[PDB]
């Protein structure tokens, strides 16, 4: 309808919807290690990787791409075996060497700190030369190798998007640009390609299929497969949680192409909105919360159409069900949490919760605001989580 709204929404959709190969933390580690640019990885005497609590937590037991392994050492080995030009896709075209893994295991000294995103590599060789590199802050800004390159959008556009209402999103999915239609279809393609086998199929009903497909894709992403995931705000698990429940609901129901496209577009819009509103860092599972808000809004739009009260009731029930949940790092178990998210969405399509019930917001906007504020209230827990995992 309005022109500026369509332009802003299109630009932000083109900005936030990317292709992420596995977890951004292991990619970060490999990219920093390749930014050190070691000429001979077998001439290394000591490697000193420094991470913050969140990075160490997320990368402790997540699958490293093209290594068939888990942990931070495979990411460091892949960075040694990678090229900086691939940036976050550092693990492309590599040939994993178990010999180099055994070589670096004796020399990789990892040290954790309490701070925002921090990734500092300091490598020494046999000759004595030292090579340092550092990536800092939430935006992936390299401060030592100085290699200009992620996914930046100025604050004015973010503030203008935060001031949009759900009716703007409902009117956008009726006037979808063709480029955005292809982007949504590419999203569906990328996230559906992540379905590899059965992980949690306990029936043939709709919720069973939703849980099964979502957990299968999450397990595929967590075991270190060389397959990208269509991520919103560089969080692939959030994109999985936002898309696959709707994909499996549509697969179990009408099998409508345009309808699934519109529902997933609305889900991505809602997920981007919830990510913007949750401005502060948090140890709460942002994937489950945000991607599930997007998924439940998309499922409610699929079930009831452009019904405002239905969407508000779905948001209220989702806020009542599963708000506040730990983010104990990238793991194979993360899939389970997303499974719960599926539940949290499905059960919200059949129950209405009054606004008085606890932290439930008055409508969708207040639900998102309350979830974001609670995420802010939970505060920094990554220090205690990393202290737990060290035992």
**Active-site residue list:** 23
Question: Contact between 271 and ligand SF4 (CB under 6 A)?
Answer: no
Ligand-binding site membership of 285 (annotated): yes
CB within 8 Å of 289: residues ≥ 6 apart: 274, 278, 322, 323, 325, 371, 375
Stretch of 75-83, 164-172, 263-271, 345-353 contacting its own copies, by CB under 8 A = 345-353
Tell which one of 301, 346, 367, 368 touches its own copies (CB under 8 A).
346
Where would I find the H helices in the chain?
3-16, 24-36, 53-59, 72-80, 98-105, 155-162, 166-172, 178-192, 206-222, 236-252, 257-277, 286, 292-304, 308-321, 334-346, 364-378, 382-389
Tell which one of 52, 55, 58, 319 touches ligand SF4 (CB under 6 A).
58
Question: Six-digit token pair at 6?
Answer: 């369509």
Stretch of 32-40, 81-89, 133-141, 323-331 contacting ligand SF4, by CB under 6 A = 323-331
Question: Contact between 304 and its own copies (CB under 8 A)?
Answer: no
Question: Contact between 334 and ligand SF4 (CB under 6 A)?
Answer: yes
Question: Contact between 20 and ligand SF4 (CB under 6 A)?
Answer: no
Residue 360 binds which entry of ligand SF4, its own copies, none, with Cβ cut-offs from 5 to 8 Å by kind?
A: its own copies
Q: Using CA atoms, how far apart are residues 88 and 228, in angstroms rounded to an integer?
A: 11
Question: Contact between 285 and ligand SF4 (CB under 6 A)?
Answer: yes
Residue 117 binds which entry of ligand SF4, its own copies, none, with Cβ cut-offs from 5 to 8 Å by kind?
A: none
Question: Contact between 114 and its own copies (CB under 8 A)?
Answer: no
CB within 8 Å of 389: residues ≥ 6 apart: 57, 60, 328, 329
Q: In the bound complex, what is the minimum distance in angstroms from residue 350's beta carbon to its own copies?
A: 6
CB 210 within 8 Å of CB 346:
yes
Distances (CA, A) of 225 to 22, 67, 233: 8, 9, 20
Helix (H/G/I), strand (E/B), else coil: 134: strand
Tell which one of 173, 216, 337, 367 touches its own copies (CB under 8 A).
337
Stretch of 80-88, 145-153, 179-187, 328-336 contacting its own copies, by CB under 8 A = 328-336
Tell which one of 54, 63, 120, 286 touches ligand SF4 (CB under 6 A).
286
Q: In the bound complex, what is the minimum distance in angstroms from residue 281's beta carbon to ligand SF4?
A: 12
Question: Contact between 205 and its own copies (CB under 8 A)?
Answer: yes
Q: In the bound complex, what is the minimum distance in angstroms from residue 146's beta carbon to ligand SF4?
A: 30
Stretch of 106-114, 123-131, 135-143, 349-357 contacting its own copies, by CB under 8 A = 349-357
End-to-end CA distance of the chain: 57
Ligand-binding site membership of 119 (annotated): no
- Angle between helix axes 3-16 and 178-192 (nearest 10 degrees) is 30
Biggest CA pair distance of the chain: 70
Q: Using CA atoms, how far apart are residues 78 and 83, in angstroms rounded to an integer?
A: 9
Backbone φ and ψ of 23, nearest 5° = -80, 140
Tell which one of 207, 261, 268, 300 touches its own copies (CB under 8 A).
207
Tell which one of 353, 363, 364, 367 touches its own copies (CB under 8 A).
353
Residue closer to its own copies by CB (options 37, 347) is 347
Residue closer to ligand SF4 by CB (options 41, 228) is 228
Residue 354 binds which entry of ligand SF4, its own copies, none, with Cβ cut-offs from 5 to 8 Å by kind?
A: its own copies
CB 352 within 8 Å of CB 316:
yes
Distances (CA, A) of 349 to 299, 314, 324: 8, 6, 20
Helix (H/G/I), strand (E/B), else coil: 148: coil
Q: Using CA atoms, how far apart are residues 68 and 370, in angstroms rounded to an integer?
A: 40
Q: In the bound complex, what is the minimum distance in angstroms from residue 284's beta carbon to ligand SF4?
A: 8
Question: Contact between 221 and its own copies (CB under 8 A)?
Answer: no
Helix (H/G/I), strand (E/B), else coil: 138: coil
Residue 1 binds which entry of its own copies, ligand SF4, none, with Cβ cut-offs from 5 to 8 Å by kind?
A: none
Q: Using CA atoms, how far apart are residues 325 and 316, in angstroms rounded to an integer?
A: 17
Q: Which stretches of the chain bind its own copies, using CB under 8 A?
A: 57, 60-61, 70-71, 199-200, 202-203, 205, 207, 211, 284, 317, 320-326, 328-329, 331-334, 336-337, 339-340, 343-344, 346-347, 350-351, 353-354, 356-360, 370, 373-374, 377-378, 381, 384-385, 388-389
């Amino acid at each position: 309808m309005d022109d500026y709204k369509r332009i802003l929404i299109t630009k932000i959709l083109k900005n936030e919807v990317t292709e992420a190969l596995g977890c951004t933390e292991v990619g970060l580690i490999g990219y920093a290690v390749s930014l050190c640019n070691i000429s001979d990885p077998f001439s290394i005497e000591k490697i000193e990787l420094t991470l913050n609590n969140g990075s160490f937590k997320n990368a402790y037991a997540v699958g490293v791409p093209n290594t068939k392994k888990y942990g931070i050492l495979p990411a460091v080995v892949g960075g040694l075996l990678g090229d900086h030009k691939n940036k976050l896709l550092v693990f492309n075209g590599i040939k994993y060497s178990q010999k180099l893994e055994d070589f670096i295991k004796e020399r990789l000294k990892i040290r954790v700190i309490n701070s925002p995103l921090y990734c500092g590599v300091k490598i020494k060789d046999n000759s004595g030369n030292t090579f340092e590199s550092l990536i800092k802050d939430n935006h992936l800004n390299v401060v030592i190798p100085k290699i200009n390159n992620i996914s930046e959008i100025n604050g004015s556009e973010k503030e203008e998007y935060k001031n949009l209402e759900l009716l703007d999103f409902l009117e956008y999915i009726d006037e979808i640009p063709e480029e955005i239609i292809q982007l949504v279809e590419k999203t569906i393609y990328t996230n559906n390609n992540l379905i590899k086998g059965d992980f949690l199929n306990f029936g043939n009903d709709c919720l069973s299929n939703m849980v099964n497909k979502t957990t299968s894709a999450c397990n595929t992403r967590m075991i270190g497969e060389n397959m990208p995931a269509m991520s919103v705000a560089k969080s692939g698990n959030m994109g999985i949680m936002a898309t696959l429940p709707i994909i499996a609901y549509d697969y179990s129901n009408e099998q409508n192409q345009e309808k699934l496209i519109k529902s997933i577009l609305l889900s991505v819009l809602v997920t981007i909105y919830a990510t913007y509103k949750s401005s502060y860092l948090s140890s709460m599972c942002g994937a489950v919360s945000k991607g599930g808000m997007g998924a439940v809004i998309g499922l409610c739009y699929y079930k009831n159409g452009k019904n405002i009260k239905k969407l508000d009731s779905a948001a209220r029930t989702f806020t009542a069900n599963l708000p506040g949940i730990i983010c104990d790092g990238g793991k194979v178990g993360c899939a389970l949490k997303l499974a719960s998210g599926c539940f949290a969405a499905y059960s919200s399509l059949f129950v209405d919760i009054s606004y008085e019930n606890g932290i439930v917001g008055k409508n969708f906007k207040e639900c998102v605001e309350n979830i974001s504020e609670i995420s802010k209230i939970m505060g920094d827990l990554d220090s205690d989580i990393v202290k737990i995992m060290s035992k």
